[PDB]
Design a protein around this ligand. Sequence first.
Ligand SMILES: O=C1CC(=O)N([C@@H]2O[C@H](COP(=O)(O)O)[C@@H](O)[C@H]2O)C(=O)N1
Ligand SMILES: O=C1CC(=O)N([C@@H]2O[C@H](COP(=O)(O)O)[C@@H](O)[C@H]2O)C(=O)N1
Lengths: 217, 218
Amino acid sequence: MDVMNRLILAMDLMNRDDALRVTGEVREYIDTVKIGYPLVLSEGMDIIAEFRKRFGCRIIADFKVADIPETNEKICRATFKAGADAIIVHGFPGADSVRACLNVAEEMGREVFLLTEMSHPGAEMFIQGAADEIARMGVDLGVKNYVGPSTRPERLSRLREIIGQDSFLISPGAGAQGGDPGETLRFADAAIAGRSIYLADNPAAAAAGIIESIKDL
Amino acid sequence: VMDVMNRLILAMDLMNRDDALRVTGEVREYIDTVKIGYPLVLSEGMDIIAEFRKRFGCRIIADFKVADIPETNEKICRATFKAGADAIIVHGFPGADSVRACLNVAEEMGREVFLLTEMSHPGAEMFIQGAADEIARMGVDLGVKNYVGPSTRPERLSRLREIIGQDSFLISPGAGAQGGDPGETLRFADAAIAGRSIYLADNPAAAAAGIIESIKDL
Ligand SMILES: O=C1CC(=O)N([C@@H]2O[C@H](COP(=O)(O)O)[C@@H](O)[C@H]2O)C(=O)N1
Ligand SMILES: O=C1CC(=O)N([C@@H]2O[C@H](COP(=O)(O)O)[C@@H](O)[C@H]2O)C(=O)N1
């Protein structure tokens, strides 16, 4: 996956007009957009097609899929029918639930991103202790795309070690949550940026600023 | 606690608007509480909640298994309650701050949060089961009053009930299609969730009636 400037936009605005405007303002810097439930539940799944039509960008559906196998398959099918190129799935619910997603992705020509450890403080309670094992599970299942925390570079580094250099790794947490884009890119292929861009007085300048800081990478 | 008719909640996971409406309408005389999840919402839109309210006036539990960071969880809950959902289901494994974010929005918006502790599928044994008791205890400490536990594991459902106490509200999926028994499930849960055993039956109404008949004494 060729992510322009190794920067993925987390478009979590909840208004179609604003989401489209801001995304358009940074289109010259980013060609990969992560769309989650904040926008989808506010504007509908048709927003994904609107983005591909307007920006011809790659779309990662960040739905943190975390249901039983049967329901997971339905969620993935509905998501890919909407035009998403990939979907993010939680690993905590187990191997069968992840496999269900992998099956639909293969069937519709899409990619599955396995979320191992999360970036927020609460991740330390239950997720962190199971993260390494979740990552190994991904390897065992043939998962090639992963999500790790920018807020804990040592943990992100460990995730990279487990999955190897061939696997693709994206990471949220830089900016608003305290992570550093440059440090994150020492281990992740691409850094995710939401508020640091869409909540900035000048989103375009914010995006340009982030890229300027990692220009040597 | 919500008064769930016949202690039976319909898991409406059909992905077709017409079929979902037909089936739900056919069993309305037996069920007044419907669980709507992403299979239907991602296929027909959040307005499906509005249509169910208008057509059936049934209570709506949005099964979105919210599992994001606090900031995003808050937005998901706000959008969901704005759409008309009476309650939303949230995962406890992401931690206390993520759950608290949902509780705060529910409190501010006058709605309810259901905390999913242990799940019913086989994969739940890998990571969730080992953290389930603590997740439940965390819920109690946070003031959570509504919970979700597995019908497929009576022993686990029983322990969950003990942890949350008799005053807490507990609903449980897994009976029927996944192998659980409605009767046994209701020994610990306030209401049992039923999806495929009802919506895939040739006669959903008869299926619902059959399930209720087997638990009439309860
Ligand atoms: O561990 C994780 C996973 C994840 O997807 N995310 C998402 O990544 C984005 C981060 O946005 P922000 O840059 O903090 O504003 C949001 O859409 C989150 O829901 C996260 O922050 N942490
Ligand atoms: O542990 C859990 C949680 C849950 O919500 N569910 C949901 O409960 C319903 C069960 O449906 P079914 O009766 O097996 O067809 C589905 O909507 C599932 O996504 C589950 O099966 N197990």
